[PDB]
């Protein structure tokens with residue numbers, strides 16, 4: 001299951017990793033760089049997957065929800081508009097995530113984190129800033145490893161979390177991206193950020209694959225590296241995942 005021959009060149013210049021597991025059997029299908037796989041880091045926008053489960057479970061959104069933009073610039077042009085739960089997921093609209101956390105509230109988020117067994121469960125935010133409610137998952141206190149993300153994703157698709165079944169399937173639906181070359185279906189989510197107080201970038205791309213073979217899988221592509229001042233780490237993590245998945249017979 002060592003796929004280093006293919007994955008190494010794709011992750012050159014970074015500390016990267018890749019994991020692919022069969023969702024039903026938990027069999028490891030492919031791995032690159034287990035040491036990086038075990039290292040906890042900020043989930044960044046991949047935390048939206050957890051927030052989506054919470055929001056649907058708590059019945060504060062549905063698929064017809066329109067998140068209303070406040071007309072002020074949010075940093076990225078794609079963020080400067082109304083959104084749906086689908087486009088929230090697709091474009092990692094951070095202000096929607098923050099609207100959602102403020103609505104659920106800290107203690108209830110902590111309770112969900114405990115139910116999800118999610119990473120270090122540290123939602124305290126930045127030292128001395130009391131900003132955890134709206135920043136904890138963004139290069140801050142909350143950390144989770146690629147291996148932990150695999151098992152979280154596995155729980156989701158197997159309905160082994162104490163949330164509404166619809167909350168799970170609406171969130172999965174809203175992750176759908178495309179089909180791959182052999183028609184396998186890709187459901188995924190990016191996240192990226194700079195490491196606090198450093199120049200390093202971290203990136204993720206993770207999710208589900210549903211094969212016409214019948215098999216379902218969960219995967220995680222993640223990296224950390226000095227890639228300059230343009231945040232491209234999730235672009236790279238995504239690219240790499242798709243390249244690697246298309247080489248496989250799933």
Ligand SMILES: *C(=O)[C@@H](NC(=O)c1c(-c2ccccc2)noc1C)[C@@H]1N[C@@H](C(=O)O)C(C)(C)S1
Nearest residue numbers: 044045076092094138190191192193194231234
């Ligand atoms: C989630 O990971 C979100 N990332 C950020 O908010 C982010 C940025 C940023 C860079 C460029 C433009 C806007 C924001 N800088 O630091 C952080 C923590 C969103 N998701 C990312 C993704 O890969 O999904 C981005 C870069 C698209 S923004």
